[PDB]
Design a binder for this molecule. Sequence first.
Ligand SMILES: CCOP(=O)(CC(=O)Nc1ccc(S(=O)(=O)N(CC(N)=O)c2ccc(N(CC(N)=O)S(=O)(=O)c3ccc(OC)cc3)c3ccccc23)cc1)OCC
Length: 282
Amino acid sequence: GRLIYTAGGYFRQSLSYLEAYNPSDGTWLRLADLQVPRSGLAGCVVGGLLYAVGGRNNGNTDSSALDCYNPMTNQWSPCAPMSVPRNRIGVGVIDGHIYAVGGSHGCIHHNSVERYEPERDEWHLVAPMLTRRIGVGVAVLNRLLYAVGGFDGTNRLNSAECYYPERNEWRMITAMNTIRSGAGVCVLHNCIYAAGGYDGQDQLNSVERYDVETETWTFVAPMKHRRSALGITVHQGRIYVLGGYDGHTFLDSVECYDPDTDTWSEVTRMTSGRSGVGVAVT
Ligand SMILES: CCOP(=O)(CC(=O)Nc1ccc(S(=O)(=O)N(CC(N)=O)c2ccc(N(CC(N)=O)S(=O)(=O)c3ccc(OC)cc3)c3ccccc23)cc1)OCC
C-alpha cells in the first residue's frame, strides 16, 4: 500500500510541508519538514527513497539542491547538488537514475540535462535538449525520456522532444494541440498525459494523451479545476493532480482521473492550498 507524497509548494511563501495521502482510506499524514522551504521543485522515487529536486526558496534563490527522504526513518538527508540551480524543473527516472531536465536559474533558461547516480552521489551532464525549457513536463516511456512543453524564455511551448539514453541524443516529437508551461506530465498505460498548465493567457483544464504508436496527441476528459504548477502522479492505474494555481486561487483540490471511464472526480483536499509541489508515490 503505497502513499502519494507531496513535498514543499508555495502559498504566499515557499513551504516546507511534506505530506502523504492514502487513497485506500482518505487519510493524510504529516511527515518531516524539508530543511529549506521550496517551490517549483520536482519529486521522484528511487529504491523506495523520496527525492526532492531543485526549485526555489521564495533570501529568494533558485535551488541546485537534491535532498533524499527515507519513509522508514522519516528523515531528510542532503545529496550531491546539481551542476546548476534549476527552478521549475522536470525530472524522470531511468534505471534508478534521476534525470534533471531544464528549469531556470534567474533569467537563464536551461536546455541542459544532468543525471544522478544514487549509488554514487554523483551528477553528470548528458546531451542538452534542442529547446530551453522551464516549467517542463517529464515522462519516462519505453526507456525513453520525454520533455513536454514549458517556457523557453521567449515563447510558451507546445513542442516535445525525446531523449535516447543509449545514443545520448534528443529528437523532436509531435507537438501538442495546446501550449502548456507548468503542466502535469505523467505516464499511464503506455501513454504520456499532459494535464493543465498555462497557455500564455489562461490556466488550462484540458488534458491531452500522446499515443506513441500513432505519434498523435488526442484530448481526453478535462479536469474540474483548471490549474498550472500542479502536482501529478500515478497510483494504482489512475492519475492524481494535486493543487496548483487557477489564475486567482492556490488550489487544495486533488482530482483523480479514471482512464476506463474517462472521468475526473475530486477525491480529497490537501490540508491547505498550494502550488509548485513535488509529487511522488512509494
Ligand atoms: C501579471 C498578471 O498577474 P498573474 O495573476 C497572471 C499569470 O501569469 N499567472 C501564471 C501564469 C503562468 C504560470 S506557470 O505555471 O506556467 N509558471 C511560469 C513559467 N514560465 O513556467 C510557473 C509559475 C510559478 C511557479 N511556482 C514556483 C516558482 N519558483 O515560481 S508556484 O507554483 O509556487 C506559483 C507562485 C505564484 C503564482 O502567482 C501568484 C503562481 C504560481 C511554477 C512552478 C512550476 C512550473 C511553472 C511555474 C503560473 C501563473 O500572476 C502574477 C504573479
